[PDB]
């Protein structure tokens, strides 16, 4: 998928191949998900003035390159969270994480005052992967309109890892008749 993942970079790059970094905390990338960094997930505050209900860590952990929080955090807030323990590398297996992270994304939104922060640290790789795959597994979107439609309302740039696993569920999607035209 060397091709499809250069497809897809440039779709997040500039026309001049280039990659911005997030010119905001936080945005709403589709109705009622939400797409930050971690100084957002730590500031309850401002969760309950969105009215986030529900908070998604793609990059739990202990690390500089981790946030390092639980549900324990949250508990006050009436917050409910997953925490998935992530690494922002090429060769971290994200995948394995899809069907659990789209799960809690579908029991958010069924929930009709639901909304879902899904976070990294930067909101940038790890956490918009996630939601990349949520619209393709429970949106019908293939991976070019998903990907586009979240970069149009936040820049964003998965690694190209990660991109290669999203080709690949797109390729498995796609066979299973489960993309939209
Ligand atoms: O997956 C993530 O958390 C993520 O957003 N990584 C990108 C990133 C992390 C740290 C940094 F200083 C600059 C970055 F662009």
Same mark, same amino acid.
């Given at each position: =998928?060397?091709?499809?993942?250069?497809?897809?970079?440039?779709?997040?790059s500039? @026309?001049?191949g280039?990659?911005?970094?997030?010119?905001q905390?936080?945005?709403?990338?589709?109705?009622?998900?939400?797409?930050?960094?971690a100084?957002?997930?730590?500031?309850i505050?401002?969760?309950?003035?969105?009215?986030?209900?529900?908070?998604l860590n #793609?990059?739990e @952990?202990?690390?500089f390159?981790?946030?390092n929080t *639980?549900?324990?955090?949250?508990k006050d807030?009436?917050?409910?969270y997953?925490?998935?323990?992530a690494?922002?590398?090429?060769? =971290?297996?994200?995948? #394995?994480?899809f069907?659990?992270?789209?799960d =809690?994304?579908?029991?958010?939104?069924?929930?009709? *005052?639901?909304?879902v922060?899904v976070?990294?640290?930067?909101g940038?790789?790890?956490?918009?992967?996630?939601?990349? #795959?949520?619209?393709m597994?429970?949106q019908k979107?293939?991976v070019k309109?998903?990907?586009?439609?979240?970069?149009?309302?936040?820049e964003? @740039?998965? *690694?190209?890892?990660?991109?290669?696993?999203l080709?690949?569920? *797109?390729?498995?999607? #796609?066979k299973?008749?489960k993309?939209?035209?």
């Amino acid at each position: =998928f060397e091709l499809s993942v250069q497809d897809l970079n440039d779709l997040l790059s500039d @026309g001049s191949g280039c990659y911005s970094l997030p010119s905001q905390p936080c945005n709403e990338v589709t109705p009622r998900i939400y797409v930050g960094n971690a100084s957002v997930a730590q500031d309850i505050p401002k969760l309950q003035k969105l009215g986030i209900t529900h908070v998604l860590n #793609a990059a739990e @952990g202990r690390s500089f390159m981790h946030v390092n929080t *639980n549900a324990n955090f949250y508990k006050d807030s009436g917050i409910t969270y997953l925490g998935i323990k992530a690494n922002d590398t090429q060769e =971290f297996n994200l995948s #394995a994480y899809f069907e659990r992270a789209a799960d =809690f994304i579908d029991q958010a939104l069924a929930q009709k *005052n639901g909304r879902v922060l899904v976070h990294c640290r930067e909101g940038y790789s790890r956490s918009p992967t996630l939601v990349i #795959a949520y619209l393709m597994m429970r949106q019908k979107m293939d991976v070019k309109s998903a990907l586009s439609i979240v970069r149009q309302n936040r820049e964003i @740039g998965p *690694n190209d890892g990660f991109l290669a696993q999203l080709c690949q569920l *797109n390729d498995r999607l #796609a066979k299973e008749g489960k993309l939209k035209p």
